[PDB]
């Protein structure tokens, strides 16, 4: 009986260690190293980490007593589930409001539409604020930490930030200061809010 | 024999699940929610997560064969250790250069000295860049994502950013634009670099 439980349990331990190593190598030297295809893998890794801890909680209450002290392990699981469930409905509401498909992001439910040259690019923000900063830094626009590609001082005068419940705000560029070379320090101040 | 291995292994699984839950409740709704005492707990949680994965790797190579396929689990451990070791020496070099005590932070080894009113406040940055942004947002200064407390448009004209190896740069405030109320969009451009 020891052999099969052994094999299964150190297999679980080794896969947990492998996901730990994935997180470590992701965060140590690739935290914001030009997140073009790495932001997506961050998002999906968090998305698959949700069921990892859900599975740990549900498996911690199937191989022990469930009434004296082990019954917490399932009671602690269910709340996570509802949080998980809440996640979806929030994202669903966001996916009901817009059609960006950049929803279902575990970080937050807030969308940033930047109509850069060409089409509009959608990024997930963290919170909605009155003032939004932007930098160029040798022709690489970065608004709120998201690298959006080649750009110059002649930026776009307006960009949208939409929340889920009852918020769709607009930001207008103002006081575009230029730094040596082509680096810039463009601003975005909220001026219009649209409900519903 | 099944009983003691059982108790130990689901105890390990439940403590792993508990640390997962700690990470989830930390990141979901408290990612940047005024990190005054929570940034420190983030740092120490990462610091204690390093030996968590180290222990997982070392324990994955003690209860199985160590020559055919299990010998990876220790060979994968040692590299983490050297990375861990490298961590310390890097921080040590930083702690040799300055005396801020804000080193030993798992994110990066870069210090940001802001001489705000009173004494100088030290924060850990992520990378050294030419342009640094700052916002006020109803009297709450936030430079590069770090909430530094009450402030107005009459900011500090200079702040230091020191790296570890051979870098100690200075930034001067320029083009201080004001937003409705008391919100601001102050800038910081690097102008002097001091080696050694």
């Amino acid at each position, epitope marked *: 009986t020891v052999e099969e439980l052994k094999k299964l349990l150190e297999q679980w331990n080794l896969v947990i260690g492998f996901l730990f190593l994935t997180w470590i190598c992701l965060l140590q030297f690739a935290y914001a190293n030009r997140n073009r295809f790495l932001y997506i893998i961050k998002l999906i890794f968090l998305w698959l980490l949700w069921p990892v801890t859900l599975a740990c909680f549900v498996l911690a209450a199937v191989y022990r007593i469930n009434w004296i002290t082990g019954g917490i392990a399932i009671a602690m699981a269910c709340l996570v589930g509802l949080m998980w469930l809440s996640y979806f409905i929030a994202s669903f509401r966001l996916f009901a409001r817009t059609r960006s498909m950049w929803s279902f992001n575990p970080e937050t439910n807030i969308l940033l539409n930047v*109509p850069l040259h060409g089409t509009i690019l959608t990024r997930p923000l963290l919170e909605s604020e009155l003032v939004i900063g932007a930098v160029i830094l040798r022709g690489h626009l970065r608004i709120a930490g998201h690298h959006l590609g080649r750009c110059d001082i002649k930026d776009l005068p307006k960009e949208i930030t939409v929340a889920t419940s009852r918020t769709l705000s607009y930001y207008k560029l103002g006081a575009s200061q230029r730094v040596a070379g082509d680096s810039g320090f463009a601003a975005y101040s909220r001026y219009r809010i649209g409900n519903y | 024999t099944v009983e003691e291995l059982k108790k130990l292994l689901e105890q390990w699984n439940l403590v792993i699940g508990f640390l997962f839950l700690t990470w989830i409740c930390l990141l979901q709704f408290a990612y940047a929610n005024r990190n005054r005492f929570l940034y420190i707990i983030k740092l120490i949680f990462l610091w204690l997560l390093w030996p968590v994965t180290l222990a997982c790797f070392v324990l994955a190579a003690v209860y199985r064969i160590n020559w055919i396929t299990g010998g990876i689990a220790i060979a994968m451990a040692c590299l983490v250790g050297l990375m861990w070791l490298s961590y310390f020496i890097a921080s040590f070099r930083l702690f040799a250069r300055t005396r801020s005590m804000w080193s030993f932070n798992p994110e990066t080894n870069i210090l940001l000295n802001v001489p705000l009113h009173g004494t100088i406040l030290t924060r850990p940055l992520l990378e050294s860049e030419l342009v640094i942004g700052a916002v006020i947002l109803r009297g709450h200064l936030r430079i590069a994502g770090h909430h530094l407390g009450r402030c107005d448009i009459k900011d500090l004209p200079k702040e230091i950013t020191v790296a570890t190896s051979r870098t100690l740069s200075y930034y001067k405030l320029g083009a201080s634009q004001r937003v409705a109320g008391d919100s601001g969009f102050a800038a910081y451009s690097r102008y002097r670099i001091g080696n050694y």
Partner: antibody
Amino acid sequence: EVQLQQSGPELVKPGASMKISCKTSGYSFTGYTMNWVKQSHGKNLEWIGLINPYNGDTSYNQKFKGKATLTVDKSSSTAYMELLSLTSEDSAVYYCEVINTYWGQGTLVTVSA
Amino acid sequence: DIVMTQSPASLAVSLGQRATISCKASQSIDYDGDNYMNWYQQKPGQPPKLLIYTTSNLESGIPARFSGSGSGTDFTLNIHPVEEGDAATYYCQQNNEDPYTFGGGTKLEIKR
């Protein structure tokens, strides 16, 4: 170099429909909310509606809900505001403006037989 | 529903004197912690021209003679150095509730 040109003056009869153009130049057409404003009977200003050139997303007011509709053609970079069931109170100057700073020339509409 | 009634009936000032306009909100227009009041200047025969977009910090390209202030349900537009070339109509817009309604309109007359 944002420039907006409307379809000049107009004269229609009560009970008909009309179209107002908002040809744009100097910027990428997709990206601006393209708000509309109506002014008539002196110097009375009020809001009509906004349409997103990217993908629909029309937002009107209950006063003008059903009275007028907005259509967007991304090829010509022009707006195509459409007015239905005009009446003597609809004789107005219509402005199409993008970001509350670049206003249009203004289209004068007279509804009388 | 949030009809705003600014109450300068007619304003007539000479050169250099202050010109104050007193647009008033309806019930509680201070959404999201601040007021997004917009001020528009419209010369006859010309479309309205924006001066201030959020209650203060006027846009670039406009002389600093225009200033905005106020909060809650009381807003004020101030022009201290009234010069020769400004005799247009001033309007206030809310840009905050379901309708983006404008103000009643105040005519500015230069005394000479």
